[PDB]
């Protein structure tokens, strides 16, 4: 659901700053990860793809070939409150987008294209949060 997705996003995004230098991602491109979900934020930069790899690797969410690791992704999603309701659909959506961009060999560029596809499909399928819902989770700390 969009609510589970807010919890996932709020945790995943904590690794943004530690990943920023290696990925070449300027604060001008994305200052806080929560803004990935703004209707207004265009998911396009190669460097955002690189950052996504960095952040994913922190939790083993990529396989050997820099595609999602389905079982690690399932376990991660299920580590959040009510995660079981989102896990199946989220892995199926990401994997469907990966297949559409399988001819992109550049890992950073492929990952940002897949990220943009996933964002559009999460909206169509009703699992895309609003930035406010993501903030609400960050603001409980
Ligand atoms: C394999 C991606 C890890 C993840 C995740 C999701 C976190 C919440 C929103 C970010 C979406 C990233 C999609 C990247 C898929 C690239 O193969
Ligand atoms: Mg710019
Ligand atoms: Mg490769």
């Amino acid at each position: 659901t969009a609510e589970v997705m807010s919890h996932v996003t709020a945790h995943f995004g904590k690794t943004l700053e530690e990943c920023r230098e290696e990925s070449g991602l300027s604060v001008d491109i994305l200052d806080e990860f929560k803004h990935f979900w703004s209707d207004d934020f265009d998911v396009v930069h190669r460097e955002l793809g690189c950052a996504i790899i960095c952040m994913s690797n922190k939790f083993s969410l990529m396989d050997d070939d820099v595609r999602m690791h389905h079982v690690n992704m399932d376990e991660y999603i299920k580590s959040f409150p009510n995660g079981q309701v989102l896990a199946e659909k989220m892995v199926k959506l990401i994997h469907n987008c990966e297949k559409q961009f399988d001819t992109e060999t550049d890992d950073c560029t492929r990952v940002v294209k897949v990220a943009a596809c996933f964002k559009e499909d999460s909206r169509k399928e009703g699992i895309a949060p609003e930035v406010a819902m993501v903030e609400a989770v960050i603001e409980k700390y």
Side-chain angles (χ1 to χ4, degrees):
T1 66
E3 187 170 350
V4 186
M5 189 74 83
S6 74
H7 286 261
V8 181
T9 300
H11 174 280
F12 184 79
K14 295 160 170 179
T15 75
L16 186 59
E17 288 305 326
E18 75 195 79
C19 279
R20 187 183 288 291
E21 194 151 0
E22 68 206 74
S23 59
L25 184 79
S26 172
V27 299
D28 277 350
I29 307 166
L30 183 65
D31 51 343
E32 304 266 50
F33 195 75
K34 62 201 173 156
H35 297 306
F36 174 90
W37 292 113
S38 300
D39 289 325
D40 279 68
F41 178 77
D42 288 312
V43 174
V44 290
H45 289 82
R46 191 175 180 281
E47 302 99 317
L48 178 59
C50 298
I52 292 168
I53 296 173
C54 178
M55 292 166 75
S56 290
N57 281 341
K58 298 293 193 175
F59 309 117
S60 291
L61 304 178
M62 300 289 189
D63 78 2
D64 285 359
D65 209 9
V66 200
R67 270 71 173 178
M68 170 180 54
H69 188 291
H70 296 202
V71 163
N72 295 340
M73 185 71 73
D74 189 77
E75 289 185 348
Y76 182 63
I77 294 162
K78 297 168 178 171
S79 84
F80 291 100
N82 266 313
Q84 59 88 12
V85 313
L86 171 62
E88 182 134 46
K89 190 185 218 325
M90 181 161 176
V91 162
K92 181 151 293 277
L93 286 194
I94 294 169
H95 196 47
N96 182 272
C97 289
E98 290 175 332
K99 293 181 251 177
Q100 291 182 57
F101 291 102
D102 195 61
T103 69
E104 184 53 85
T105 68
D106 185 285
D107 291 335
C108 298
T109 297
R110 195 165 47 58
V111 164
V112 76
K113 289 170 159 170
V114 169
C117 179
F118 176 68
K119 179 173 169 186
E120 190 191 2
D121 292 351
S122 287
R123 295 159 172 250
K124 300 181 181 317
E125 295 296 313
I127 62 171
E130 300 296 310
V131 180
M133 319 171 59
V134 187
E135 289 167 333
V137 172
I138 292 145
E139 296 174 3
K140 280 190 282 174
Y141 296 76

